[PDB]
Amino acid sequence: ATEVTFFDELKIDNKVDIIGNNVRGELPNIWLQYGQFKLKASGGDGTYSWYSENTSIATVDASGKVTLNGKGSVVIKATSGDKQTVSYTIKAPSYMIKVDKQAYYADAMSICKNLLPSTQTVLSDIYDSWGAANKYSHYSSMNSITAWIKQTSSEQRSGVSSTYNLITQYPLPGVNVNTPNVYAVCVE
C-alpha cells in the first residue's frame, strides 16, 4: 500500500518548437514540405502518445515531433498515460513549398505546372519561418538547394532567371535557364 499522485489536466502547448531555427512560437502560416516541429504536452502523468487524424497532411512520432506532408488542415491528438486526450489543430497554410528534382527553367515550369515561386521573398520567407532546409530529416543529406524563381518579362527575353538557395540564402541573378544543379521548387 503506497501513496497516490495527482496531476493537472492534459494540455498541448500552443507554443511550437521549430526544429530548423530553434524558435518557440506558433506554427508558421507558410509551410516547407517536410518541415518539422515539436508539440509540447503538459499535465497528466508525463507520459504521452501522439496520433494524426490524417497522415496525408501531417505525421507525428512518439516524441511529439510532427512532420508536414501535405497542404491542408489536420488534427493531432496527445494521450497521457492517465487516459487523457487533447486535440491540437493544424491550420492549412497560405502556401506550401515542394522540392522536386533538378531541371532547367523551362522543364521546372512544366514540372511545377507553372507554379514556380513568384519572387525571392516567397522562398526567403520560408527560411525565416523554418531555417535551413537541411536541418530537417527529409533534406539532411543535401548541402545546397538552389531553387528557380519565376523569371521576369525581361529575364524571359534574355534566357535567364534568378535563383535562391533554401539552405544558404544565396541569391543569384542572370542564371541561364539551361543551368544544371537547380531544383524545381513548386509553390502550392
CATH of the domain at 135: 3.10.100.10
Q: Which helix (H) or strand (E) holds 122?
A: helix 120-130
Structural domain count, the chain: 2
Can you name the residues that pair with 104 across neighbouring β-strands?
A: none
What is the DSSP code (8-state) at residue 89?
E
What is the rounded end-to-end Cα distance, in angstroms, of the chain? Answer: 60
Of 95, 114, 140, at which residue does a domain stop? 95
CB atoms within 10 A of CB 98: 18
The reply to whether 103 and 56 lie within a common domain is no
The reply to whether 84 and 105 lie within a common domain is no
CA 10 vs. chain centroid, Å, equals: 27
Q: Which three cell numbers stand for residue 67?
A: 512532420
The residue assigned the cell 507553372 is: 114
CB atoms within 10 A of CB 64: 21
The reply to whether 149 and 168 lie within a common domain is yes
The rounded distance, in Å, linking the Cα atoms of 108 and 183 is: 8
CB atoms within 10 A of CB 76: 22
**67 and 46 Cβ atoms separated by less than 8 Å:** no
Q: Which three cell numbers stand for residue 165?
A: 538557395
Can you name the residues that pair with 163 across neighbouring β-strands?
A: 148, 172
Resolution for this experimental structure (Å): 2.6
The rounded distance, in Å, linking the Cα atoms of 82 and 7 is: 9
Of 59, 78, 95, at which residue does a domain stop? 95
Q: Residue 89: which residues within 8 A CB-CB, separation 6 or more?
A: 73, 74, 75, 76
- Domain span at residue 47 reads 1-95
What is the DSSP code (8-state) at residue 109?
H
**166 and 133 Cβ atoms separated by less than 8 Å:** yes
The rounded distance, in Å, linking the Cα atoms of 49 and 109 is: 42
